[PDB]
Structure 1
Amino acid sequence: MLKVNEFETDTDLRGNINYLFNDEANVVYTYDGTESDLLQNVNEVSKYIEHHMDYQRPRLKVLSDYYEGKTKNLVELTRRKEEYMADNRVAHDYASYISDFINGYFLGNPIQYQDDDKDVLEAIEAFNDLNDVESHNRSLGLDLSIYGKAYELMIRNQDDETRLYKSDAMSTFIIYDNTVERNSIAGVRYLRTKPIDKTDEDEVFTVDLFTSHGVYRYLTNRTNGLKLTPRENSFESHSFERMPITEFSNNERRKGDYEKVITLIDLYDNAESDTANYMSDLNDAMLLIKGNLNLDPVEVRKQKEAN
């Protein structure tokens, strides 16, 4: 444990990456080439997927666990002094209180639509009613509040209807044109399949790549280094003329609402569980007796009823 060795001995000190404020997280992915220049070299999408998994996803995961109240104080104290002492695990859920309040304030009241042309207005209203856009909008606002960014996917369904679905932030991202205009070149979604009864060791991921002209489907897993192999019936045309996924941002920096106070929430957790330990481990009061004396431990039992 001369520190230069701790790598080779796997001693090095575990989860200490920052994640939230790291420079690689929260970056915007850009590509210099056209959509064709990307699609002919599908490997590059593999690099973007890898980068996302290694740097962006961890941040989002942390944020999500805080929204679910699984703050660091719950997990880390698993390593607590598990002796004959009490547990005193505590988590205050501030992240949820905040996100629910801010989102309800912004989108608790449905967005209204006005137009001068009733044909367009009624086509919009029909689509909104079919897709229950009110609930959809509220859910997007909630993702904006916790993760700072949210994604929506639009697809022409098998039943021949235009459908709108939210896409989880931990599994979706967009690669933009490098120009100042930043058109979106291509979007990707990737989900871990797993059985319920086992941990699949390879951690198989199903990857969908959306272009302006169609969807490409591939299969991968983490340990094979994410080599994209086209799935059977890989390609599927779509009738839009631009990439179907859209991204929404909480602010210019795409930073979440409580992202900047997580350290304060942690401090409050630690303080409260410290007082909890003080309460649990010390005796409230005791009758102290000094001096050379004979105390019969049978007589001490009268302590509660002696005058």
Structure 2
Amino acid sequence: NINYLFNDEANVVYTYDGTESDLLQNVNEVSKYIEHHMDYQRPRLKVLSDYYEGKTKNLVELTRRKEEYMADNRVAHDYASYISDFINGYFLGNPIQYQDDDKDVLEAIEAFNDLNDVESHNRSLGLDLSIYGKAYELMIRNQDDETRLYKSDAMSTFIIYDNTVERNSIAGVRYLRTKPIDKTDEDEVFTVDLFTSHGVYRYLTNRTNGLKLTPRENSFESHSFERMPITEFSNNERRKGDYEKVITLIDLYDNAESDTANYMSDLNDAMLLIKGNLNLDPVEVRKQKEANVLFLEPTVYVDAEGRETEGSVDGGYIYKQYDVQGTEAYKDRLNSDIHMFTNTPNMKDDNFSGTQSGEAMKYKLFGLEQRTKTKEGLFTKGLRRRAKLLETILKNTRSIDANKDFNTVRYVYNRNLPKSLIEELKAYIDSGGKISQTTLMSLFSFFQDPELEVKKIEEDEKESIK
């Protein structure tokens, strides 16, 4: 793995020194980036994805040990999922709130967000950020003349950028493998889609001809955006995943556990040990479990000179044993270090008094908050480009006036943390807030039908007049 994860070329960003038109002239440059992506970058992402699915090295690597009366206690610990689900849930569990002064913009924003289910989309991006360190989204003008937003798989998408300090994006490449469910042959074909500021060009390729990009039938297709539609989100400046740096420690925990399972499985827990020149009937030994007295009578050797002397006989139980103190201290240290470096709370030392369940978590997760605030900034940087695409195509359909600028939108992030509805109600009402009766009742589940309760109260308030 490490030869993939920490290779230098596995995480390079692709620049190109020409314009987009200089890249679509002589498209043979794009093939080189695809080759580099397949050769250096996809292997890293694959290693990361395997660990999220729990297909850690300790399953797929062969033991030199392999025979009958031995066992492969291969075990894989699923730390990577546990980490990424926790960190993404903390960040994007509660949706982003969109705020704007101009309701003509905000209605279009929220109608797009509604149509595209942007809560679920945002969480599905944020998990890619946690697994791979980067994620891509594609926006298209669909048939039925409608604007759609989809996540693009990081294993098959990359972007080429300007060589300038401004680092604009020149072009975006998606490439997919056309595998049957039946068979695979001496060639296998990758469809390539090359997105640009004005359209997408579609190509067919295979690795065996050197990824030659020859146009697929109906190759070019225009789009109404005025910039390249694929947007790239980063987990951090370095585009590194959240568990990528503890994968070594995860392997060590896999090994330190599977080797104890081997010790448990190979050796015998206890045995009766009998020693001495004795006749043991191989059938009487089976009565060993119903025995109460073990009698060992020694052999009496008789010397040629007539002297008689007794052989040694011995009996006792011997039992399998290992260094529990040092292996537990070692596996405790590995587990603790995994949680420390990922800033996840360590469930073996984490014990709660039952006191202030919100403030307590804000205490525990202080370090994860420090990383998330950077992630939050880099996420907003992507959301602003999504918004700029949206306004560009709404104007290019006269769905909104050209005068609108969507950069007035603000994106408000609430961390997923436990809330006490009762203590919040106390705070709100002590602050002089008001609530309607229907809204108040809706907060409490002991009303079966808040709709009917109002009428029943009207009866009580009526017939007390009499």
TM-score (norm 2): 0.62
Partner of 2:199: 214
Shift of residue 80, structure 1, vs aligned partner: 4.2
Residues 185-225 of structure 1 show CA distances to partners (whole Å, capped at 9, x for unaligned) of 00000000111011233121000000000000000011111
For residue 78 of structure 1, report the CA deviation from its aligned partner: 6.1
Over 3 Å counting, the alpha-carbon distance change for 1:179 and 1:265 in structure 2 is same
Deviations for 1:102-146, whole angstroms, at most 9, x for unmatched residues? 000000000000000000000000000000000000000000000
Q: 1:289 aligns with which of 274, 284, 291?
A: 274
Kept in 2, the 8 Å contact 1:144–1:150? The answer is: yes
Q: How far is the alpha carbon of 1:173 from its aligned partner?
A: 0.2
Q: Distance in 2 between matches of 1:163 and 1:232?
A: 24
**1:78 & 1:211 partners in 2: Cα distance?**
49
1:143 aligns with 2:160: no
In 1, distance between residues paired with 2:12 and 2:194? 20
How do 1:213-252 residues align onto structure 2 when only pairs under 5 Å count?
Answer: 213-252=198-237
Does structure 1 retain, via aligned residues, the 8 Å contact 2:141–2:148? yes
Q: d(CA) in 2 for partners of 1:105 and 1:268?
A: 26
Which one has the bigger helix percentage? 2
SS in 2 for 1:225: coil
Ranges of 4+ aligned residues in structure 1 off by more than 6 Å: none
CA RMSD of aligned residues (A): 5.5
Q: Does 2:53 correspond to 1:68?
A: yes
Are 2:177 and 2:190, in contact at CA under 8 Å, matched by a contact in 1?
Answer: yes
Structure 1's 48 and 86: CA in aligned 2 closer, same or farther, altered over 3 A?
A: same
1:83 positional shift: 3.1
Change (3 A) 1:79 1:36: farther
Three-state SS of the structure 2 residue aligned to 1:89 is coil
Return closer, same or farther for 1:76/1:159 CA change in 2, 3 Å cut-off: same
Q: Secondary structure at the match of 1:199?
A: coil
C-alpha contact 1:194 1:200 (8 A) present in aligned 2: no
**Which runs of 5 or more residues in structure 1 are unaligned?**
1-15
Aligned-pair distance for 1:73? 0.2
1:126 aligned partner: 111
Distance 2:210 2:160 in 1: 20
- Taking the aligned partners of 1:162 and 1:287, their CA distance within structure 2 comes to 77
Identical positions, percent: 100
**For 2:188 and 2:63, how far apart are their aligned partners in 1?**
26
Instruction: Work out the CA distance in 2 between the residues paired with 1:191 and 1:82.
Output: 41
Alpha-carbon distance change, 59 to 80 in structure 1, aligned in 2, over 3 angstroms = farther
Cα distance in 2 for partners of 1:89, 1:120 equals 56
Per-residue deviation at 1:86? 1.9
Q: Is the 8 A contact 1:43 1:228 kept in 2?
A: yes
Of 207-216 and 76-85, more deviation after overlay is shown by 76-85
Q: Counterparts of 1:42 and 1:232 in 2: how far apart (Å)?
A: 17
Q: Matches of 2:237 and 2:57 in 1, distance apart? A: 28
Cα gap change, 1:163 to 1:82, in 2 (>3 Å)? farther
| Structure 1 counterpart of 2:176 | 191
Match of 2:244 among 259, 263, 280: 259
Q: 1:259 to 1:118 in 2, by over 3 A?
A: same
**1:233-271: CA deviation from partner (whole Å, max 9, x where unpaired):** 100000000000000000000000000000000000000
Distance 1:156 1:87, change over 3 A: same
Deviation at 1:48, TM superposition (A): 0.3
Report SS of the residue matched to 2:181. coil
Could you say what secondary structure the match of 2:274 adopts? coil
Range with bigger deviation, 74-83 or 38-47: 74-83
Distance in 1, Cα, partners of 2:217 & 2:225:
23
Query: 1:79: how far off?
Result: 5.5
Q: Contact 1:25 / 1:55 at 8 angstroms: preserved in 2? A: yes
1:163 aligns with one of 137, 148, 163: 148
CA distance in 1 between counterparts of 2:195 and 2:143 reads 18
TM-score, normalised on structure 1? 0.93
How far apart are the structure 1 equivalents of 2:149 and 2:177?
A: 22
Alpha-carbon separation, structure 2, partners of 1:115 and 1:159: 29
Report the equivalent of 2:20. Answer: 35
Summarize deviations over 1:162-195 as a string: whole Å, max 9, x none.
0000000000000000000000000000000111
What SS does the corresponding residue of 1:287 show, helix, strand or coil? strand
2:87 matched to 1:102?
Answer: yes
Q: Deviations over 1:46-101 (max 9, x none)?
A: 00000000000000000000000000000003664243312211000000000000
Q: Secondary structure at the match of 1:207?
A: strand
| Structure with greater Cα Rg | 2
Change (3 A) 1:125 1:80: farther
Structure 1 partner of 2:41: 56
Q: Are the equivalent residues in 1 in contact too, given 2:63–2:72 (CA < 8 A)?
A: no
| Distance 1:137-1:75 versus aligned 2 partners, 3 A rule | same
Q: 1:198 to 1:78 in 2, by over 3 A?
A: farther
Contact 1:77 1:89 (C-alpha < 8 Å) held by counterparts: no
